[PDB]
Paper text:
Here we show that substitution of a surface residue (F306C) at the entrance of the channel of CuNiR results in an altered second sphere coordination of the active site Cu. Comparison of the crystallographic structures of the ‘as isolated’ (1.7 Å resolution) and substrate bound (1.75 Å resolution), allowed us to assess the effect of this substitution on the substrate access channel and its associated water network. The substitution did not change the highly ordered hydrogen bonded water network (Asp92–water–water–Ala131–Asn90–Asn107) from the T2Cu site to the protein surface that provides the major route of proton delivery to the active site. A notable feature of the channel was the presence of an additional water molecule hydrogen bonded to the liganded water of the T2Cu ion. This second water molecule has no counterpart in the numerous structures of other two domain CuNiRs, and presents an altered energy landscape for nitrite displacement of the Cu-coordinated water molecule during catalysis. Since the structure shows access to the substrate channel is enhanced, the weaker apparent affinity for nitrite may arise from the presence of the additional water in the second coordination sphere of the T2Cu stabilizing the coordinated water that nitrite needs to displace in order to bind. An additional contributing feature revealed by the structure is the positioning of the gatekeeper Asp92 residue in the ‘closed’ conformation that may result in a slower escape of NO from the active site pocket, resulting in a weaker apparent KM value for nitrite due to competitive binding of NO to T2Cu in the micro-reversibility of NiR function. The sensor loop10 (His94-Asp92-His89) that reports the status of the T2Cu site to the electron-donating T1Cu site remains unaltered. The space generated by the F306C mutation also allows an adjacent surface residue at the mouth of the channel, Met135, to adopt a dual conformation. Because access of both water and nitrite is enhanced, we attribute the 50-fold increase in apparent KM for nitrite not to there being more water to compete with, but rather arising from stabilization of the ligated water owing to its hydrogen bonding to W2, making it more difficult for nitrite to displace.
Copper-containing nitrite reductases (CuNiRs) catalyse the one-electron reduction of nitrite to nitric oxide: NO2−+2H++e− ↔ NO+H2O, a step in the microbial ATP-generating respiratory dentrification pathway. CuNiRs are trimeric and each monomer has two characteristic β-sandwich cupredoxin domains that contain a T1Cu centre with (Cys–Met–His2) ligation. The active site is a T2Cu with (His3–H2O) ligation, which is situated at the interface between two adjacent monomers in a cleft ~12 Å from the protein surface. Electrons produced during denitrification are donated to the T1Cu site by a partner redox protein and subsequently transferred via a 12.6-Å His–Cys bridge to the T2Cu centre in a proton-gated reaction.
Numbering used by the authors:
A (entry chain F), B (entry chain F), C (entry chain F): 2 to 336
Write the structure that this text describes.
Amino acid sequence: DADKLPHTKVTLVAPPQVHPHEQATKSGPKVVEFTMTIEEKKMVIDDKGTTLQAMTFNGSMPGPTLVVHEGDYVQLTLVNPATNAMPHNVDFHGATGALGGAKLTNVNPGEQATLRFKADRSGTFVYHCAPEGMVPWHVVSGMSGTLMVLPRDGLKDPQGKPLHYDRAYTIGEFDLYIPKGPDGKYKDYATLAESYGDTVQVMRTLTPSHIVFNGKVGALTGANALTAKVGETVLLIHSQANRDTRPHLIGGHGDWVWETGKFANPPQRDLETWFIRGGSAGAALYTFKQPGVYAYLNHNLIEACELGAAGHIKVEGKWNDDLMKQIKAPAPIPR
Amino acid sequence: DADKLPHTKVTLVAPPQVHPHEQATKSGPKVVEFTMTIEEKKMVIDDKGTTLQAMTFNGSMPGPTLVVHEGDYVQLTLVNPATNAMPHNVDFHGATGALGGAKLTNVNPGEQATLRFKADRSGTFVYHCAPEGMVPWHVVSGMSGTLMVLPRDGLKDPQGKPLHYDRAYTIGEFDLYIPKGPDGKYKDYATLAESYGDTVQVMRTLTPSHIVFNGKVGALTGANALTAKVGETVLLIHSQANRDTRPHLIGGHGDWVWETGKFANPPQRDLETWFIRGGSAGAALYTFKQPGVYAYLNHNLIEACELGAAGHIKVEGKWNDDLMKQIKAPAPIPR
Amino acid sequence: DADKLPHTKVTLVAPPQVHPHEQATKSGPKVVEFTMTIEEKKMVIDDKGTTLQAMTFNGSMPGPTLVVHEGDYVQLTLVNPATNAMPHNVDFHGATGALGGAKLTNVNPGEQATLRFKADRSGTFVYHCAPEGMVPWHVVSGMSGTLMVLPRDGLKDPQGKPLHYDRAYTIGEFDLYIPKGPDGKYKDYATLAESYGDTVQVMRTLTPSHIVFNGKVGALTGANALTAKVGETVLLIHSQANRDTRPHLIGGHGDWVWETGKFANPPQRDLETWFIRGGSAGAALYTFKQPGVYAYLNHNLIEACELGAAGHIKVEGKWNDDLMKQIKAPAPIPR
Ligand SMILES: [Cu+2]
Ligand SMILES: [Cu+2]
Ligand SMILES: [Cu+2]
Ligand SMILES: [Cu+2]
Ligand SMILES: [Cu+2]
Ligand SMILES: [Cu+2]
Ligand SMILES: [Zn+2]
Ligand SMILES: [Zn+2]
Ligand SMILES: [Zn+2]
Ligand SMILES: [Zn+2]
Ligand SMILES: [Zn+2]
Ligand SMILES: [Zn+2]
Ligand SMILES: [Zn+2]
Ligand SMILES: [Zn+2]
Ligand SMILES: [Zn+2]
Ligand SMILES: [Zn+2]
Ligand SMILES: [Zn+2]
Ligand SMILES: [Zn+2]
């Protein structure tokens, strides 16, 4: 009975970071309390000034990652401020019943509600908005994120030996469907409501206009590139609430990967490219062995390089000539 | 030698049901005898009166599920009545040789034939029509179903412990390619033959017009919704003979899933969303813990909600507040 | 330290064959030396005279398969002759650092370079060209192949028992994006450079014009069909550097399959259809039990039968009536 347990309150942080948390823990079950506030807003999604009439949990695409341990209870307060135009809700794939919670969290502008569910299954799980009659529209306009339910004794390899990460990043991949006018330029809308009909027509073609990580082309590059060091193990959580994607780390590997994202299954090792099913989140570990700027991307290279699904990881430390060496630099073909 | 064994005759039932059968069995191998009759017919596939010039095994999309045990022999009589216009055949992925049987079962209108093969591999396997030169056309017009070959001692979990289901349902997902005229409305054809050329042109775009479960938008909803009870374990067999799909149960999980559909491999647990490769059938178990109406759908939500790939499961029993509770119903944001 | 070890030199062969090599080996680590030469050339890709302005390693699509053992070092000399127009490089997914080697192998026409890396992970891995700013273009015009890193003691099943193949074939699948003119016919270009802009526009639609095995429609059919005998085990290596595919052997199975292509993971058994993620190579074993001509194909049957992704395997030996028998040949439905 959950009414007996202690409560904790967690303060969420914005992607790509994930809020501090323990992996293996001595602590017993708790009710973990979270709050998120919906923000509808217009966002610029590319380097030519294209806009999206977006919908977000807590102002970001994706929404923040919530982290609990298996056996915990998640207690979410969801707030839809009066500054918004649309009703919203939440479906947690990690939850059991009532369409993931959607049936109990229908909130019109100016309202709020509070849901509890048992996080009884370990893994990374998508959450998303699911208003009746307009589910795909809210999802593809940005209303999704990840719940990570860690096993109480931390992650394990196929032989039951312990695994860990020194640092975690969360990547949400968003297939966008931005309409164009008769002139061939993307339309800019005044309100969310006025984008709907043209957007549905684009959706039905199944061809995204843009595919972005974390809300925009180049979100995870330059000053916003991800960071690590030789010797550090990173966990890359990758969510795609609507469409398949195939994550790859260029110059690296997936050392241990749960592509279906469920920690009670053995992970696979040495992956070049893994597969996130639309409607799921997965997770990969990698320990950096070389310094440099890596790219992390969807390995449909058109989706990555033309449509936007790629970021950078900047890695510090010493080059290792045993792993890789330039034996002869580019030079003329001998006469 | 198969000529020594006893024979049985099975009476098929229409999807979503599956014919009665045992899981683990004391009985030894048999020759299991089936018969199916091809019906070409025009079908209405959506709520605005769109028609498909369809082709079916036994009058349904999908065709009926055939269930045997590993080591059995499947003996199929395939009948193509003179009321049909086209030649047809059958390729069983569960079989070995002669292109799955297609080379031995070429039947013109007014003909019939009988094939035997050993069901020597456990799993769910697609069967489909495969006439030389027009294979994709017969498949996407509806000529596919599932053979389920159960291990002789029933299903097992990764540690070799027994698994079972209390009730089985079969779902065939069909990507349809219905042409449109110059006015933008879908074409209605007088005969099967006259649909061919326009349909090929749509196929080559790789963009379905509709994606449906069991032959039509909403086939598995309302009076035709699937049913279960809290405490009951259901097996969901999902076939897709031509295109990938990503099954999800909203408010539930895949407790044990063979996404590649082959029972001698360990299943994965706790899945939110699984993946059926085009050209395969997979199978998932789930034990219901909450009552309510669930949706089972392809989690490309555009394919589900716009194009038709979704059904309902109505579940009876008692709500469980430990799994999920509404702590505060939707109410105004406190002043 | 790699500078201590003996060197070997391997002579590559053209696909679908793979250069002679041992599976399990008594021999210790070596530096294995390879060389490949880039050839840009116009190729005819279908039976109506459509051309592609192609780019290749060693004149073939795919490039040749390189085979080493885990612990070896791969030493590649990459040559870009002055007869070519574009700069090129190589990214080995099997390697660690410097974007797979791409940063160290930038070679303009008339230049060459030599790279070394440790093949420290077992599996089949894609390699491809990756020039900065035009990565998808070089890949989809044909610049990819497979590195196979065999475990030092050969392949193993899930229980650690030995597996082997008697013969290996390499299949590269290429999604092509050939532009059309206002008349609806495919464009024929005079140079590689002049194809670029129109090709990018087609790429962005995500809809290939053709999908071919080994550079053309029907490459692996007729005189070029693959061959085997009843009793022989074949390994089918399948690479797709940009787009997903779903290999199937019609009339056969995947007996043992590493669909993610990494040999330190247990393989799955009895597959009808497996899944190669874009950006990866996978590998399947099958032991032939029936003679005949088999088709090996991408089981999106539109992609196979309309767009070109299918080949043939011609198999010699004796029919087995226990596996499959025609009980009654096609005959009139009894009066
Ligand atoms: Cu919403
Ligand atoms: Cu969902
Ligand atoms: Cu047919
Ligand atoms: Cu098939
Ligand atoms: Cu190149
Ligand atoms: Cu790559
Ligand atoms: Zn309490
Ligand atoms: Zn560490
Ligand atoms: Zn890129
Ligand atoms: Zn970049
Ligand atoms: Zn008999
Ligand atoms: Zn039961
Ligand atoms: Zn829906
Ligand atoms: Zn519904
Ligand atoms: Zn040396
Ligand atoms: Zn052998
Ligand atoms: Zn074909
Ligand atoms: Zn053929």
